[PDB]
């Protein structure tokens, strides 16, 4: 209709998806693991009138002509993937990651995800599995006459058998880095599975070749800073207000155009 | 947006940043070896819309020009290093500094981390560590036949075993000194790795070189005085209420522009 | 347009850099050695439409003539260098000045800039730095074999070695003075840099030319004062409020111009 609808509506699209990822950052408080999300703006075409060159004498030059331009495309989705701070759980369950790393959890369906959540589980078969049956990488079997377990700072787990004295190791837990942790797909359930973005994953126990340390009895938090969310709600609901003024704006011009 | 709105932004986001390190401070009193931290503030760019020099006559100067200026950025997150309180924990396995010096430790990459924790414990192969099965350096040794440890101001570490009448020099226990403390980057547990603002780590025994004594049966308390944090947290309680204040204020400002 | 919709714009831009300066100064409260700003403002041009003078008869001669006058031109900011309140950090490594004077920096980039704080570090190399690495002037270098630092209140620095019985003098700290510290041009980190309003700088010791002295273990807090700009940002937010309904009624006179 007119140019100018256009370009408002871009606006308000694009204060709409800031709004839906300051909710979903809002909402997931309290949720371990969690990484802030902030969307990243993008300007649009613009339409050329008078080429900024294009030397209008013979001589002279024509310093920055006329282009217009439209939209604010927004063009990605930064995931923060800094370390929460941790909590004191005193859960015997509940493992939390301190440095870079991932661990790896074998969907049903047969692949890979990866997940930052020590809020584990041993379900009948004594797997180590996590808030859904979705069991870890590689397998950790705790035995059924187990009487406590512990995972030490280098991921050994350990077992103490009854009668036994001593913590007889069940198993391993290593983790997995990718050269760009930013680059995973969510997919729901607190995972992340491989795109090519992300890179190959180099999986290997914790500690070594840049992976961090698990601490037993401590979860990760949210990193969702809560002051900055409010004030990122006050101004994206100003932005909105603003466009939907132009909106008006650019309707009031038309109809007076139409009534001509 | 306007410009108010995002001086005021930063201003909450630094006043949030000074509540939590003091919050982290008054927590972590009575945690064994903590060391108190303070946050160092830093004021942003300056835009300025008139140059504080800029003749405007041939004559005249125009003293104090127009700069604006934004933001409260946090520069700084330090940590005071002073001695903690000395207190009698009657435990023999535990031990304490006085004055300058690390605990050296082996992570499992086979770097190097430094704790003010002497609660030592012996794992099952005998090694000293220290809450997480941390191997301390150099390597040390306690005898399966151990009856009672003791050590001395100058760190060695002696046993006493069945039937001799001899504390056998089982290992010695040296301090490192770093020539900035502050510098330090903790990772948790009260451990702090070795970073290129800190200095390169000067190992040495206890009591030479500037370095502090080993107290046996003592327990260095964090250097946090409840009093003290307490009115640094008025102070910035207010200072943080002041800043949500203004960034009202820009709301109804920008709501009432677009009743407008 | 209107005559009156470019005045109310003027007073609305007025008012918005008002506020903006109000927030600056807000958001740096409990920013050591931050000076309070204040903006100061001037009015626009005055279209004469009959001259106040200009005699209309032989003998009459018009007092006060019809002049209308446009725009509220925000023409400085001033910024006030007066001695803010020192406080006990107690810190042998935070030291504030009393009275006039500012401790001069080396920037990277070779020139020099002049700070009002105290909060200094010793980098890995034993330098005096200022919250940013920054070497102060002239230079200085505590040895490595110190034990503590003290900084007279002349500004003469010396250090404790290790077993020699005297506070050997590792240097001098002097102060740096302006005839107009006003006109300093500020460029963050809380560095000014020379500006030619301010004048050419006078460089002495502690107390003489004027200087001030050294105060260590106090910090100087910022000169903000808190009831003031409060009351500042409520009468700019009323004033805000004010001039968007003079241009809300200018709007209302032309769109029933337009009507008609």
């Given at each position: 209709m007119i140019s100018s609808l256009w370009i408002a509506k871009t606006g308000l699209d694009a204060q709409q998806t800031n709004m839906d990822v300051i909710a979903n950052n809002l909402a997931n408080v309290s949720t371990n693991g969690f990484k802030r999300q902030?969307?990243?703006?993008?300007?649009?075409?613009?339409?050329?009138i008078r080429q900024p060159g294009a030397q209008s004498s013979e001589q002279t030059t024509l310093p920055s002509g006329l282009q217009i331009g439209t939209?604010?495309?927004?063009?990605?989705?930064?995931?923060?993937?800094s370390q929460g701070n941790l909590s004191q759980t005193n859960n015997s369950k509940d493992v939390a990651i301190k440095g870079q790393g991932?661990?790896?959890?074998?969907?049903?369906?047969?692949?890979?995800?990866?997940?930052?959540?020590?809020?584990?589980?041993?379900?009948?078969?004594?797997?180590?599995?996590?808030?859904?049956?979705?069991q870890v990488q590689p397998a950790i079997t705790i035995?059924?006459?187990?009487?406590?377990?512990?995972?030490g700072r280098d991921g050994v787990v350990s077992v103490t058998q009854q009668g036994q004295a001593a913590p007889v190791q069940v198993g391993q837990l290593n983790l997995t880095t990718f050269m760009n942790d930013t680059g995973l797909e969510s997919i729901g359930e607190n995972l992340y599975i491989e795109t090519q973005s992300s890179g190959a994953p180099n999986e290997s126990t914790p500690g070594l070749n840049g992976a961090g340390l698990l601490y037993q009895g401590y979860v990760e938090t949210s990193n969702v800073n809560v002051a900055e969310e409010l004030v990122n709600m006050i101004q994206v609901q100003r932005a909105y207000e603003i466009n939907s003024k132009a909106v008006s704006t650019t309707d009031q011009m038309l109809q007076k155009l139409t009534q001509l």
């Open positions: 902030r969307a990243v703006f993008e300007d649009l075409l613009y339409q050329t939209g604010v495309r927004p063009v990605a989705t930064e995931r923060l993937h991932f661990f790896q959890v074998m969907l049903p369906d047969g692949t890979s995800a990866y997940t930052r959540d020590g809020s584990f589980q041993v379900d009948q078969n004594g797997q180590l599995v996590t808030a859904g049956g979705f035995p059924a006459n187990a009487l406590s377990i512990t995972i």
